[PDB]
Tab-separated table of C-alpha atoms and ligand atoms in Angstrom:
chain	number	residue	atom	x	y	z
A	1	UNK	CA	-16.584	-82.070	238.259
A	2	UNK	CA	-12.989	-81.334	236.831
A	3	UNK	CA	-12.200	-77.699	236.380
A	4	UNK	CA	-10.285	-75.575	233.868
A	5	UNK	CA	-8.886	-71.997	233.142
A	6	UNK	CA	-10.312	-70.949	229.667
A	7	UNK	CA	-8.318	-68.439	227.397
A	8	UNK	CA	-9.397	-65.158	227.459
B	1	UNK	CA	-23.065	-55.481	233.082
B	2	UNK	CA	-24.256	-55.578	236.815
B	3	UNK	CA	-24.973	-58.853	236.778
B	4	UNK	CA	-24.542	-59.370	240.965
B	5	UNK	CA	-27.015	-57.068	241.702
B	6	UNK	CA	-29.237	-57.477	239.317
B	7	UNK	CA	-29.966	-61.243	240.595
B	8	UNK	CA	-29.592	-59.949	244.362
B	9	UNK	CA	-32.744	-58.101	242.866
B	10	UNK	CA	-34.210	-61.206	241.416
B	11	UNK	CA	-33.623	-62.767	244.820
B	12	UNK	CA	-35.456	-60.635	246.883
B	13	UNK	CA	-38.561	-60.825	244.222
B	14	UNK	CA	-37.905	-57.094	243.147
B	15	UNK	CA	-36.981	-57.671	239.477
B	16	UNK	CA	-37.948	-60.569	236.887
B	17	UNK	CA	-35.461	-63.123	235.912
B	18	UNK	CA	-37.010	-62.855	232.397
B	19	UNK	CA	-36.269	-59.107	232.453
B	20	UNK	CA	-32.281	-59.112	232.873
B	21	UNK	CA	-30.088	-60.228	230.466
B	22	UNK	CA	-28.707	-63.419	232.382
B	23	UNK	CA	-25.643	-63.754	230.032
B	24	UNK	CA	-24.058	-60.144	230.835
B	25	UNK	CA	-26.577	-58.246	233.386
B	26	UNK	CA	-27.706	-55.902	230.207
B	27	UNK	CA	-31.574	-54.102	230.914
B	28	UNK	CA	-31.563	-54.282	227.049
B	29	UNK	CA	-33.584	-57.457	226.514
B	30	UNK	CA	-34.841	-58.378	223.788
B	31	UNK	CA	-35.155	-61.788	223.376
B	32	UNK	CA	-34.895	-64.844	225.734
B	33	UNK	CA	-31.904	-67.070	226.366
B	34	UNK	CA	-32.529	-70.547	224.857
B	35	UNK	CA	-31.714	-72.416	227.569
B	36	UNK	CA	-32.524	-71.162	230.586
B	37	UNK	CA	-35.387	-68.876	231.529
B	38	UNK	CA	-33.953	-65.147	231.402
B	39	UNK	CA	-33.928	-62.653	229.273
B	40	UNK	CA	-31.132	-62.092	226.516
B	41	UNK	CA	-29.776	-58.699	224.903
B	42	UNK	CA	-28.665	-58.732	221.156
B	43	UNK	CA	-24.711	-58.586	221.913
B	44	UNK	CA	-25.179	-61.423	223.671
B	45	UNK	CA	-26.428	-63.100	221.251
B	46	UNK	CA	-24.223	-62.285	218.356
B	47	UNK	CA	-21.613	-63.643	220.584
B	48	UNK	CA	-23.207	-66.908	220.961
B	49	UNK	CA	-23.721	-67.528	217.153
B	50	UNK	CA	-19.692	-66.136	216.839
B	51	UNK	CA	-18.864	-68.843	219.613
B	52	UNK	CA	-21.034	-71.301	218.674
B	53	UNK	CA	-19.659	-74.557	219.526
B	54	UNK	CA	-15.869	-74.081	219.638
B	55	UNK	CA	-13.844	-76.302	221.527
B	56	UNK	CA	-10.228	-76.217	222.727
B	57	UNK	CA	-7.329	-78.963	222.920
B	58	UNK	CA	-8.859	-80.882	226.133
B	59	UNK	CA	-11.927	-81.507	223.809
B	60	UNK	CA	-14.150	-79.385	225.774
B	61	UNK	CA	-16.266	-76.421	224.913
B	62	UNK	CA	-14.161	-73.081	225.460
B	63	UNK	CA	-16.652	-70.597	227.029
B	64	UNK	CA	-19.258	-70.666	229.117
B	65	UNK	CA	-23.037	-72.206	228.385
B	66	UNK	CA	-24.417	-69.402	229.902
B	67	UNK	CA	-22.751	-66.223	229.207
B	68	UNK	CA	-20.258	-67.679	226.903
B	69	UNK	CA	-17.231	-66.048	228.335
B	70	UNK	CA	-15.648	-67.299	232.153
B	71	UNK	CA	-12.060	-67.692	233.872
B	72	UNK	CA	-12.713	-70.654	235.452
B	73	UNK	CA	-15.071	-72.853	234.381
B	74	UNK	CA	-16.538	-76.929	235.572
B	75	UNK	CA	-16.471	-79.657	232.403
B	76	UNK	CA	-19.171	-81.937	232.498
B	77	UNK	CA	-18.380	-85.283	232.514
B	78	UNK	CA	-21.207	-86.910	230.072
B	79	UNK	CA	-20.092	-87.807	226.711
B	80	UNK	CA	-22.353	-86.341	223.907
B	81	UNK	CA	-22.681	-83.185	226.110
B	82	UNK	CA	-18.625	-81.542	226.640
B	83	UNK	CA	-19.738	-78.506	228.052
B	84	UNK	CA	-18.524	-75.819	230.125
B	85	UNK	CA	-19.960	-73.876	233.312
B	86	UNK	CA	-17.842	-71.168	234.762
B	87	UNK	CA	-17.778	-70.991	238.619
B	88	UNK	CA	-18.775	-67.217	238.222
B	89	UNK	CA	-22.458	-67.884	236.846
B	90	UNK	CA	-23.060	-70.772	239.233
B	91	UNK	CA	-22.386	-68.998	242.602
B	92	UNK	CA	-24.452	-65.874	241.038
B	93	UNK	CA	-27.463	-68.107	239.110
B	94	UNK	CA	-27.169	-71.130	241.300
B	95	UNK	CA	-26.126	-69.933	244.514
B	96	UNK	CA	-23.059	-69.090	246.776
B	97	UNK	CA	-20.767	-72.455	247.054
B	98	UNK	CA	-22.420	-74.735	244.083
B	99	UNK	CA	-19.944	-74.509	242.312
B	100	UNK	CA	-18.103	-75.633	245.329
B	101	UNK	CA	-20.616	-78.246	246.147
B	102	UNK	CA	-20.361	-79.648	242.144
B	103	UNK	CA	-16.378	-79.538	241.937
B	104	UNK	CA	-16.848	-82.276	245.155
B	105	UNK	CA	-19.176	-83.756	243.063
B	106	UNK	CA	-17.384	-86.841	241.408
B	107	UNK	CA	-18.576	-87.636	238.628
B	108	UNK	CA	-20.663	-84.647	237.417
B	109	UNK	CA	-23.750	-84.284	235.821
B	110	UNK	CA	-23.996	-80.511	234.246
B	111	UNK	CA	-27.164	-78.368	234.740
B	112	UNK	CA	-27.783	-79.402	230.504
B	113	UNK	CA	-27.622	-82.955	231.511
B	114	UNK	CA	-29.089	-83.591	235.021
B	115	UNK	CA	-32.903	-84.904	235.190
B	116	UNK	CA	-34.057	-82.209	237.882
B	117	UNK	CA	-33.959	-79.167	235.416
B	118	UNK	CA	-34.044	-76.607	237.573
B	119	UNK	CA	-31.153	-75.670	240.103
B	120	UNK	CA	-31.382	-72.326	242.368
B	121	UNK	CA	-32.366	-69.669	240.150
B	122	UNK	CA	-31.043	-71.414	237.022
B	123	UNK	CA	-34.337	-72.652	234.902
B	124	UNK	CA	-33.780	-75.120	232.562
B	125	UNK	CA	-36.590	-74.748	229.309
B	126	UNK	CA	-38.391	-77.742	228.780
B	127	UNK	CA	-38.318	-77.066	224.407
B	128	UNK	CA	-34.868	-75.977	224.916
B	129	UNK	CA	-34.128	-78.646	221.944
B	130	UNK	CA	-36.182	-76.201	219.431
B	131	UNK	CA	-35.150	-72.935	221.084
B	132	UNK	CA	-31.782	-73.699	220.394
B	133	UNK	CA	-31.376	-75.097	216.902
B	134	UNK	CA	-33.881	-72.278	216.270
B	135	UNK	CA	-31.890	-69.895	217.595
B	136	UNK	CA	-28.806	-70.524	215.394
B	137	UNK	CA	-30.633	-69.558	211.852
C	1	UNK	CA	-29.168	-59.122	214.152
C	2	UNK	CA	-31.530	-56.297	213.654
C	3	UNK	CA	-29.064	-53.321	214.805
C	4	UNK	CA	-25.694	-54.850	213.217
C	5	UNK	CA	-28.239	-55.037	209.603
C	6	UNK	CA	-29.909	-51.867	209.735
C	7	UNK	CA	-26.156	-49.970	210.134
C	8	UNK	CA	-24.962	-52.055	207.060
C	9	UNK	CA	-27.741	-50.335	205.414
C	10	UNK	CA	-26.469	-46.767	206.637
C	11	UNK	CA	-23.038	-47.779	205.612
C	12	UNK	CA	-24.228	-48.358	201.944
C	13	UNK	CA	-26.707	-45.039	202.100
C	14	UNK	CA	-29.812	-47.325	201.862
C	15	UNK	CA	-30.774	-45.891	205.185
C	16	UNK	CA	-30.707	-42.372	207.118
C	17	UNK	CA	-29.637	-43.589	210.550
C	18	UNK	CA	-32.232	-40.550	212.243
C	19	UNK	CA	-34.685	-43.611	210.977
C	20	UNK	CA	-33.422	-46.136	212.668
C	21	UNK	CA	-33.290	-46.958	216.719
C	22	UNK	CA	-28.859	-47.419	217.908
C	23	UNK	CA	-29.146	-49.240	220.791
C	24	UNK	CA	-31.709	-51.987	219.508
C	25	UNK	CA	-32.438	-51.517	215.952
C	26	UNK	CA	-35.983	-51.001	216.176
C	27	UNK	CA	-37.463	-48.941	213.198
C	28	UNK	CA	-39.643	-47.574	215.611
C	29	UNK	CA	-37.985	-44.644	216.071
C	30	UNK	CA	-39.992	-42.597	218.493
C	31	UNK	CA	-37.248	-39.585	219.175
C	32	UNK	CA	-34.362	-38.263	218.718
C	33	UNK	CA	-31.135	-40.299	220.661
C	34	UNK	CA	-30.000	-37.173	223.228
C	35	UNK	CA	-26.190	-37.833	223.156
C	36	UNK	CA	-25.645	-39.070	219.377
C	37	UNK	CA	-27.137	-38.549	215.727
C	38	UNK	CA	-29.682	-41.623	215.580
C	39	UNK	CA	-33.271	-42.454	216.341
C	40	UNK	CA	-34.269	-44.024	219.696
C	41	UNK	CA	-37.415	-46.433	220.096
C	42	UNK	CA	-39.436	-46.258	223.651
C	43	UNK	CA	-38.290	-49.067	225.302
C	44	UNK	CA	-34.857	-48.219	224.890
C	45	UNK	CA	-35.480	-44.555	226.709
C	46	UNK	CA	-36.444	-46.332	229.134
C	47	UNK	CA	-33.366	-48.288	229.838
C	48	UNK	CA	-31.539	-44.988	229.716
C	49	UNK	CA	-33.353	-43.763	231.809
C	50	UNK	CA	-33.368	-46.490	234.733
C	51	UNK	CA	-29.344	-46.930	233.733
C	52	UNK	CA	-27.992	-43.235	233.873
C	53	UNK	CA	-25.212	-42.353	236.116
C	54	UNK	CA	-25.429	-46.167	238.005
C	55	UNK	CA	-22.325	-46.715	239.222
C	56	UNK	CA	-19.900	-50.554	239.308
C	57	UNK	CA	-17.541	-50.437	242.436
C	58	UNK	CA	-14.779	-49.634	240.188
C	59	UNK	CA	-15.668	-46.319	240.035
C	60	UNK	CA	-16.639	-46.354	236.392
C	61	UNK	CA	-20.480	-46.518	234.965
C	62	UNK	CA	-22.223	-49.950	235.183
C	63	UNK	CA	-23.718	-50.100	231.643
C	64	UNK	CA	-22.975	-49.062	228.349
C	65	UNK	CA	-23.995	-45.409	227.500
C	66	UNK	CA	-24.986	-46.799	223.546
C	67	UNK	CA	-26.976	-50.521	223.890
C	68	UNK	CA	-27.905	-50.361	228.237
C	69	UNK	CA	-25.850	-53.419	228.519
C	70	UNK	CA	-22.437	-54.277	227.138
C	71	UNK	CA	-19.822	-57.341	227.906
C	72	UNK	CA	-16.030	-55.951	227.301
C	73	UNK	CA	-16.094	-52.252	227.876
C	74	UNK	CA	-14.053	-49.017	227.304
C	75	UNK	CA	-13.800	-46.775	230.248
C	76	UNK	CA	-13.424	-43.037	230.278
C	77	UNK	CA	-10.561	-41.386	231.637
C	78	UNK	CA	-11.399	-38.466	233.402
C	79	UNK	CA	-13.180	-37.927	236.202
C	80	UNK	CA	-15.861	-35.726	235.138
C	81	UNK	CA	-17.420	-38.528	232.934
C	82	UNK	CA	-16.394	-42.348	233.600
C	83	UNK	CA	-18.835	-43.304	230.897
C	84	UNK	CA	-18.291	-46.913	229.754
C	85	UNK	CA	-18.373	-47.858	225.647
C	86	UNK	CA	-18.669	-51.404	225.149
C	87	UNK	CA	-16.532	-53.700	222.021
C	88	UNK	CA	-20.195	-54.626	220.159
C	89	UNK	CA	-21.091	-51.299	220.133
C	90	UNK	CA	-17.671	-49.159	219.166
C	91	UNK	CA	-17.313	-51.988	216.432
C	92	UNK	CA	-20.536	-51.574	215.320
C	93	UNK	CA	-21.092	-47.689	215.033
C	94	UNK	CA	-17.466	-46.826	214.820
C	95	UNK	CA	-16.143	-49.285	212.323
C	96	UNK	CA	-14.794	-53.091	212.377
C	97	UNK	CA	-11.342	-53.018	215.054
C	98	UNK	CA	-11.906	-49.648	216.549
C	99	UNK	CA	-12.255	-51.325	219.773
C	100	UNK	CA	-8.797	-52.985	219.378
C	101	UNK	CA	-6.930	-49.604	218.351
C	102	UNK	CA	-8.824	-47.842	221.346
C	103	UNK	CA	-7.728	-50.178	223.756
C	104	UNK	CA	-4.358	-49.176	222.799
C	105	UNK	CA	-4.082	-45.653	224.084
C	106	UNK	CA	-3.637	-43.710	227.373
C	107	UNK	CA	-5.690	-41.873	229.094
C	108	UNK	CA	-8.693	-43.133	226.591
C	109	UNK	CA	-11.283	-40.009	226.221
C	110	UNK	CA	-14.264	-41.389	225.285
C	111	UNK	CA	-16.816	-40.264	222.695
C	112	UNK	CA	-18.475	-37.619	224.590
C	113	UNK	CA	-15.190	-36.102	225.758
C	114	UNK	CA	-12.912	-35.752	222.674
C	115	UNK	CA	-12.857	-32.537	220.655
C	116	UNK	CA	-13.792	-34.537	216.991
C	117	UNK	CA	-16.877	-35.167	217.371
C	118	UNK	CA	-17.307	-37.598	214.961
C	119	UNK	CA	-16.200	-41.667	214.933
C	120	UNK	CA	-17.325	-43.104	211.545
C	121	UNK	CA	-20.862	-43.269	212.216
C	122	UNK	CA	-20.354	-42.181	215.800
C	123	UNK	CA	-21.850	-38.583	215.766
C	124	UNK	CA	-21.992	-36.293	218.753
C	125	UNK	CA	-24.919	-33.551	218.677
C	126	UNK	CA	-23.746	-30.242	219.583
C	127	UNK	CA	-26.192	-29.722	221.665
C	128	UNK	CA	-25.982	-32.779	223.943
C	129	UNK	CA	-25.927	-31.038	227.508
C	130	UNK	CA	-29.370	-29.185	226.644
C	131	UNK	CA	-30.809	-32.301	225.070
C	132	UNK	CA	-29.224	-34.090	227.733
C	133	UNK	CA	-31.597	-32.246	230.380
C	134	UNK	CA	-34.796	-32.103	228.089
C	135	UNK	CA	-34.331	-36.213	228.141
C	136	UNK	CA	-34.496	-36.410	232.009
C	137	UNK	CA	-38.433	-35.344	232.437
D	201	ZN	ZN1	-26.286	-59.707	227.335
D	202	ZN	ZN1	-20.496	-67.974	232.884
D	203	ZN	ZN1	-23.654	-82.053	230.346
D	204	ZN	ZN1	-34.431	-49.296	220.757
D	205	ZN	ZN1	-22.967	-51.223	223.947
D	206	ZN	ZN1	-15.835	-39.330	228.682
């Protein structure tokens, strides 16, 4: 599974 | 709120899944998520029908699926589906290392997607399909 | 939902808000909410009751002293208190934003600490500490 930072 | 502990609760068989707020850890439930079995508090769900659906520039979904917030989060990688997990809620509603385990995992099926439906403590409801589209009117 | 309706109502005097249940919404207003000017159904005594004075290993209160639950919260200032307010809830009873503009201030007293009293629909009873120990059977 690829990953990401979100924006919070 | 206390999510953590709340679920260490749930763990040992001293509290019911259904009676926690599984999106934020509120005691305040009342209603049920529409995915998962768990409960669900109100905020919760006003959130959910405020960030219903919204996507950023990658083309994936921006916040969690189940507590539609997260830092970091898996994508799955299934087409139609574009969803987003956040490593927090697995290792607490899962369990300590899936997320881990499903990074590894190449591709990746996401806990909407996969055929098992149910995955540690996460539940997945078999008339989610109806829950859900109910749940946004 | 039902709370975020109810204070709409309040807003455009079509309601009393004694009649109406702040942390849920319920119109099953069974007694009167200890801390602020507002009803309060059963259930949600009960949630106050099991989440009083729990404690987050930040030092501050794990659950919201309006709604039991809360996702982004304001925290207290002074030692004597460390009550948390969450967003939902501030916007909701204070007004639309208050959140934001509280957010922006050092220390932050919270509602139960200032000297007003009053925070748009926000009302502190005067007599909080008595009703306070009357709550706690
Ligand atoms: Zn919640
Ligand atoms: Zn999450
Ligand atoms: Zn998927
Ligand atoms: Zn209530
Ligand atoms: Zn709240
Ligand atoms: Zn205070």
């Amino acid at each position: 599974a690829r990953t990401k930072q979100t924006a919070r | 709120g206390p999510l953590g502990s709340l679920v260490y609760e749930v763990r040992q068989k001293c509290r019911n899944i259904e009676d926690i707020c599984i999106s934020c850890g509120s005691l305040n439930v009342t209603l049920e998520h529409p995915l998962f079995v768990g409960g669900m508090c109100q905020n919760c769900k006003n959130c959910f029908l405020e960030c219903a659906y919204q996507y950023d520039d990658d083309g994936y979904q921006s916040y969690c699926t189940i507590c539609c917030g997260g830092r970091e989060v898996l994508m799955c990688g299934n087409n139609n589906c574009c969803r987003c997990f956040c490593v927090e809620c697995v290792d607490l509603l899962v369990g300590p290392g899936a997320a881990q385990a499903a990074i590894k995992e190449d591709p990746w099926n996401c806990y909407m997607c996969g055929h098992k439906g149910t995955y540690g403590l996460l539940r997945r409801r078999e008339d989610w399909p109806s829950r859900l589209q109910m749940f946004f009117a």
